[PDB]
C-alpha cells in the first residue's frame, strides 16, 4: 500500500489532489471528502504494476494519512486547540484568537479559567451526512504564571483574593 | 527448578529496613498427593533495595517427584502504593494541594517523613503547575553508599477560585 498524506484543512473542506506515482511516472487525481478519518483506504484500478503484456496493470492502494496541524488536534468530529495565555487574563478575562480551518473567530472568555478548563463551543470537523453541521470546538488553556512578584504585588494579591 | 513469588513491602520498610517472618507456600508430595505446603521463612529487607530485587531461597521451592529434592523459591520485592509519596529512583515525590493565593504569595508546607519526622518547609518563591521544588536529602536511602539519601521533590496541585467579584478582578489587574 502507499500512504496518502493530507492536511486537516483538506479533510475539513475537501480537495482533489494530484499525486505522482511510478509504475513510467504518472499523475493520479485523488478526491478527498469531508470527514474522512485516518486509515481510509482508496483503490485505483489500472494504476498498478503490469505483470505481463498479455495482462492489464494491477491496482493502486492508498491509505489516508493526516499530517500534524500547528494549531489543531482532531478527536473524531471534534477539534482541540491549545492557547497559551498569561495568568492575569485567565483570572480577569480576555478574547481568544481562532484561525479556523479554511477566517478569524474571536472568542471572549469572561469566567475564570484554570489548568483543567475545557471550553466547549459547531466549530470542529464536519459531521457525516449532516450539511452545515460541525463538531464542538474544545478550548484548552496553557496559563503562564509570573516568574516573580514584588512584595507589594503579593500584598495586593492577598487583599484581592 | 524454581519460580518467582512477589514479596510486598512498604516504602517505610524499604526506608528503615525490616527483619520479619514471611509465610510462603510450595508444592510438596504428601501421602502420594501434591499438596500446597506452607512454611515460614525469615527475610531481612535492606534500606534502599529497589523493586525487582530477587531473593533466592534454596530448597524452599516446588518438589517435582516424591522423595526428590525440592527446587528453589525466588521472592521478588514489590512496593505497595503509598498514600503520601511516589518513589522515583532514590527520590520521593509528594503532591501538595494548595489554593492559588498561597501559590502566588507564599506559605509553609508540612511534611511527615517515612520515619515520622515532622518538617515545616517554607515556600518563598512563586510556584506554578510545573514547579518541582527540590528539598535536599529528604528522599530514600541509597543502597550503594550508606548514610546517603536522594531528595524530596514537592510538586503542587493549585486550586483556582471558582468565582471573583468585579471588584476583585479589578484589583488583580492592578496587582498583576
Secondary structure layout plus pairing:
Two copies of one chain form a homodimer.
Chain A: E1 2-6, H1 8-12, E2 15-22, E3 25-32, E4 41-44, E5 60-66, E6 73-75, E7 78-86, H2 87-92, E8 94-96, E9 107-109, E10 118-120, E11 137-144, H3 151-160
Parallel strand pairs in A: 1-5, 7-11
Antiparallel strand pairs in A: 2-3, 4-5, 6-7, 8-9, 10-11
Question: What amount of the residues of chain A lies in strands?
Answer: 35-45%
The overall number of domains of chain A is 2
CATH level-two architecture of the largest domain in chain A: Sandwich
* First-to-last CA distance of chain A: 60 Å
Q: What is the strand arrangement across the widest sheet of chain A? A: 6-7-11-10
CATH H-level superfamily title of the largest domain in chain A: Urease metallochaperone UreE, N-terminal domain
The radius of gyration over CA of chain A amounts to: 24 Å
Task: Output the helix-strand order of chain A.
Answer: EHEEEEEEHEEEEH
Structure characterization notes:
Chain A: This is Heat shock 40 kDa protein, putative. The structure is a homodimer. Chain A has about 160 residues and is mostly beta strands. The first copy, chain A, has two domains: about 1-70, HSP40/DNAj peptide-binding domain, CATH 2.60.260; about 70-145, Sandwich (HSP40/DNAj peptide-binding domain). Helix content of chain A is about 15%, strand content about 40%. Chain A contains three helices and eleven strands. The first copy, chain A, has helices at about 10, 85-90, 150-160, and strands at about 1-5, 15-20, 25-30, 40-45, 60-65, 75, 80-85, 95, 105-110, 120, 135-145. In chain A, strand 2 (about 15-20) and strand 3 form a beta hairpin. Chain A starts with a strand and ends with a helix. Chains A and B meet through helix 2 and helix 3 of A and helix 2 and helix 3 of B.
